[PDB]
């Protein structure tokens, strides 16, 4: 076109992905914080239990891969634990987190579009290995 060629179009796609993971982080923050209060151990239910809550707040069906995008931006954002059956459980780490995430999200976005190759259109899911 005039202003936007394939590379620029990919950047625009990525910006929507940035907007997505930023909102998703905030939603995970409210859900995990609230659910971590329900039990004496301070440990929330498995992630698959909390996904309907996360989905309703996001007004869209959120899956585990969406959640893992957050760790790509901030690896120490949450603590990841795999149980006996391999079911994923996420939890807040032991001590503003929202501001910290946005800064890293911005910095991550900067480094992606900075170099002149091919631009990814979405945040890749963080890779989790077996315990």
Author numbering: 294 to 388, 398 to 433
Paper text:
This topological loading requires the Origin Recognition Complex (ORC), Cdc6 and Cdt1 proteins. We propose that Cdt1 stabilizes a conformation of the MCM ring in which the Mcm2–5 gate is held open to allow duplex DNA passage required for helicase loading.
The fragment comprises a pair of well-defined domains corresponding to the N domain (residues 14–298) and the M domain (residues 299–430). domain (WHD) family and is predictably similar to the geminin-binding M domain of mouse Cdt1. Further division of the C terminus of Cdt1 showed that fragments containing amino acid residues 271–496 and 495–604 interacted with both Mcm2 and 6, suggesting there are multiple interactions between Cdt1 and MCM subunits. In summary, Cdt1 makes extensive contacts with the outer perimeter of MCM, notably being sandwiched between the A and AAA+ domains of Mcm2.
